[PDB]
Amino acid sequence: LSVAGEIIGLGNVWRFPYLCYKNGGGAFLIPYVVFFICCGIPVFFLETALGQFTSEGGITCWRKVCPLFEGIGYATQVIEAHLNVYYIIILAWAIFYLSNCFTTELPWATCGHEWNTENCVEFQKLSLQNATSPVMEFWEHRVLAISDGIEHIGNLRWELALCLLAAWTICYFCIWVTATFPYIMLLILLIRGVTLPGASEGIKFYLYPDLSRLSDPQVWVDAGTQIFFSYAICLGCLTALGSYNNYNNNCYRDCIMLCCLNSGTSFVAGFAIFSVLGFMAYEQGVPIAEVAESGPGLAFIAYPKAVTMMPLSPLWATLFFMMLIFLGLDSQFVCVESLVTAVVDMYGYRRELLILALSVISYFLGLVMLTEGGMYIFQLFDSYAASGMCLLFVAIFECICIGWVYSNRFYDNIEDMIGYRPPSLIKWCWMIMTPGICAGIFIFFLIKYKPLKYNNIYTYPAWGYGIGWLMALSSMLCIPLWICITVWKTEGTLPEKLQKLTTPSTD
Ligand SMILES: COc1ccc(C(OCCN2CCC[C@H](C(=O)O)C2)(c2ccc(OC)cc2)c2ccc(OC)cc2)cc1
Ligand SMILES: [Cl-]
């Protein structure tokens, strides 16, 4: 039995270093631990066991167990669709970067190009105020012509538009040895990172928590929700992951590797990246902060520099973007296949040709993020939709059902499935810990919050936060509303009616 490169993906190589550097330093690692043992493994285990016992995923599995709580599935399908639209945008930039890599001299290493301004200094070749770097000018002026403000959307970058079209075609065909390659590249990047001048200075910024700043709830809601973005929890795919098992699989001991090892790659990625930020500081005499960007560009401003600071730069630059593209496509294939499970809901009745309709709709809708100033709407797509509060609230209801509306009986089913009984701490976690911690964090965020800013300079207008609230509600308001559809369509008498909607089916 083996799983190869399953845990490794874009969820810990691109997102985790982004969030760790933005919110702060090593202080972010404390909420990443308390949200891991408690609000982590128990939910993953619950989802996997529920998907394995019922032998079905999506929404019908939640129809069988607590038919009243059928709206959970609809919430997980909408958020998956929201993720599918923008997750492919990241793969467009990698295609563009790989496209102009087949050359003797890398374009993101020298000064004097048309897009470059007069303030660039070609460092490492023989401080100075108002100075920038050539690497950042290949991100802020060439791939994405950033426009001041969200009001001005400007024109559309046609070069990036074609790259997105390729990504869709490559995978519209996906749905008509290897898998060890990413680890080698990660090791190579890590080796070239720690053995650099000033590397140890950056590490202390990463492994020394800065307390007294935990009062801000932003550090507390990004952590935990990042864990939920990883592990693929609350995305409506884990409930189908266990459907392929053989009903006699040791589910508890099964994830203990995946339940833990997937968090063992984020630490190594942080080691590899945060060591580079110390180098750029030792080269420009600047704080460990302000060397790069706090938004979703760090993975495209830190790696290309490390690759440049290495012999045979083009050859290694070609392969890194290849592994990024491969991981992104592999992650997108599964997330696009599950949404087409709408067949079970509508009994595409027989033939699933709606994949073509989904791709065309998703392509045209996603063209907004590729226009001038498209990153500004990207943050609103990543801090409120498919992240932030959209997952915490769903998880509070994820299953107080298994905890209160179904615990002891489920443990009997688990013992029947695997043979023995898991420790009783998980049951108490389900009962009181996860729905308690998540509710506390939710109330903390809603009682005292700070407006979100793009890399801590630019603040969105009122309508940006309005659209963020709209897109966040569009996934969390389905569960309370769906009870009004289920109840009030049955007999009607509340006491007698509540009983039927709660009795599970004949599993
Ligand atoms: C890169 O290649 C893959 C990596 C993980 C997966 C799984 O989720 C994919 C969901 N995506 C959410 C945002 C980005 C995450 C990331 O890219 O990391 C993952 C997966 C899901 C459903 C499956 O059956 C239908 C099978 C696998 C996954 C998730 C967690 C896990 O254990 C922690 C193992 C597999 C699949 C391919
Ligand atoms: Cl993570």
Domain residue spans of the chain = 10-502
- Cα 409 to ligand 1 centroid, rounded to whole Å: 29
Crossing angle for the helix pair 434-447 and 218-229, nearest 10 degrees? 140
Ligand 1 atom 3 nearest Cα: 331
CA of 101 to the centre of ligand 2 (A): 30
Helix, strand, coil percentages (3-state) for the chain, rounded to 5, are 65, 0, 35
Q: Which stretch of DSSP H or E encloses residue 454?
A: strand 453-454
What is residue 455's DSSP assignment?
Answer: T
User: Please, is 322 exposed, middle or buried when counting C-beta atoms within 10 Å of its C-beta (0-12, 13-18, 19+)?
Assistant: middle
Q: Which residues of 184-193 are buried (b: 16+ CB within 10 A; e: fewer)?
A: ebbebbbebb
How many other CB atoms sit within 10 Å of the CB of residue 25? 20
Residue 331 CA, ligand 1 centroid: distance in Å:
6
Please list the residues that pair with 156 across neighbouring strands. Answer: 371
Solved by what technique?
cryo-EM
Resolution (A): 3.6
- For the CA of 230, the closest atom of ligand 1 is 15
For residue 83, give the ligand 1 atom closest to its CA: 13
- Answer whether 324 contacts ligand 1 (Cβ < 6 A): no
CA-based nearest residue to 369, from 157, 201, 187, 226: 157
Q: For residues 454 and 381, give the distance between their C-alpha atoms in angstroms, rounded to a whole number.
A: 12
Ligand 1 atom nearest 12 alpha carbon: 18
Q: Which ligand is nearest to the CA of 240?
A: 1
Closest CA to 97 of 323, 310, 359, 294: 323
Q: Does residue 11's CB lie within 6 angstroms of at least one atom of ligand 1?
A: yes
- The token duo for 352 is 């699933």
Counting ligands in written order, the one closest to the CA of 16 is: 2
* Residue owning tokens 């470059």: 116
Cβ atoms within 10 Å of 423's Cβ, excluding its own: 8
Distance in Å, CA 493 to ligand 1 centroid: 44
Residues pairing with 120 in the sheet = 132
Q: For ligand 1, atom 21, which residue shows the shortest CA distance?
A: 237
Which are the contacts of 339, defined by CB distance < 8 A and separation ≥ 6? 77, 80, 81, 84, 358
CA distance linking residue 274 with residue 205, whole number of Å: 8
Rg, the chain, Cα only: 24
Mutation test of ligand 1: which of 3, 6, 10 has the most ligand atoms closer than 8 Å to its C-beta?
6
Testing ligand 1's pocket by substitution, the residue of 261, 334, 336, 391 carrying the most ligand atoms inside 8 A of its CB is 334
Number of H helices, E strands in the chain: 27, 2
Atom 17, ligand 1: residue with shortest CA distance: 9
**CA neighbours within 13 Å on the CB side: how many for 272?**
30
